[PDB]
Design a protein around this ligand. Sequence first.
Ligand SMILES: N[C@@H](Cc1c[nH]c[nH+]1)C(=O)O
Ligand SMILES: N[C@@H](Cc1c[nH]c[nH+]1)C(=O)O
Ligand code: NI
Length: 465
Amino acid sequence: GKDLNISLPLKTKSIAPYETDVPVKIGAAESLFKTNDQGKIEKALVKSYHQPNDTTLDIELKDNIKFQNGQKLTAEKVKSSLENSMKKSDLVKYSLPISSITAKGQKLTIKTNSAYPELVSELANPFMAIYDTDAKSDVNQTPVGTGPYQIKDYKQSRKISLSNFKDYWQGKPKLDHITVTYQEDGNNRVRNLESQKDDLITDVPVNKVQDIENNQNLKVSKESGFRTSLLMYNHTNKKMTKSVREALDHIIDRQGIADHIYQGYAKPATSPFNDKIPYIKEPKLTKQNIEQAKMLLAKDGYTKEHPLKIKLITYDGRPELSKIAQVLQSDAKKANIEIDIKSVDDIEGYLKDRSAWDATMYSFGTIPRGDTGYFFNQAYKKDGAINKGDYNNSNVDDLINQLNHTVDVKERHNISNDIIKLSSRDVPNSYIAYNDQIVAANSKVKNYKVTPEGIYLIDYRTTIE
Ligand SMILES: N[C@@H](Cc1c[nH]c[nH+]1)C(=O)O
Ligand SMILES: N[C@@H](Cc1c[nH]c[nH+]1)C(=O)O
Ligand code: NI
């Protein structure tokens, strides 16, 4: 009827908002701030804010917003939600250096110990979405948000069932029910859409695009966005030296990968950040050079007789990652590297054991809210939530820490470019492609989001006609 079936990759365990962005994606939860369709920060739950000095953020919340259980969204609810999220998540904690929060009625005041210009921006992060900390349910299964669709049932790592929240603050949502099921294999997601098992899918394999476009019952939406695919190195394994990382960097054929594996739905990458961000000074594009790789590996003593052995992790959710792994393995052989590919079902959980991998295929939204700070803090600082390989260089640390308290935007751009230049010398990861997000749907599904931040999907206007 007016029910929507969504098929997503990257199955979750907990679906607390501070564990995954899935509750924001599927319309269950909202952050205080958001980005609009052009990527700019906007008030969402907030009516007004002021910044009277560089350590003070005064917020007045909208007065007409309820949680899905009917409880009013107040300043005290926001305070308790934020403090809980900071307590329970390293990602949230390291993004929000908040020193104190006071609340009364609809007003709260957030303090920092020193200037942190990206505070408002990080309050738009979906991991900072607001939920009712007093709800009598398990926030890991059925968090209570302000979104248009309330989570009613969660089968862990398999299925999320949501129902229309009729009192949703922006307007009456247009669907009755949503069912979200996880499917890691992109080809399976496409088959589910074709057989009408599901109505809306993300992360369409590039080689199925034409097939879907040919179908008059279906439609494809594509967006260049700001997701980067990469080869992430485990810096805690002493064999993963600078020479080894340089060598693997030169076994990659970025141009070939973009043309043939992404079939043109991507561009060759250099830094973490899409070059369509105008202030970014990218490092020089690395072109494939097997001889150079062989030479570099000679430095550490590797030969055809005694090759480097690499355990490379991959996963299906982003469909092109394992295709890249396959051709890396084939090409690396020519350079005296024997790569073992291990595909895993739960990539975030698997990488926690740093004894179990040498490198991994990976994909991340490296600049979701227009600033490079978030990526640096989460990926290049020790204990950052996506620094799976524990890269850390005190000289890069120093610049990141300076960036974090830098207010002048031109100076933020300069420091960010210095961070990019300096860190690139270490090859902390090998950035492979800036690739498009491709979504597909039954043609009767209307008004889902496919916008450049690559987070949002369902809102109160999404519908079926
Ligand atoms: N960050 C990786 C792995 C992941 C699993 N779940 C969320 N993320 C990706 O999005 O592809
Ligand atoms: N899946 C999102 C968010 C995330 C946090 N940690 C891992 N992933 C991304 O890759 O951008
Ligand atoms: Ni991710």
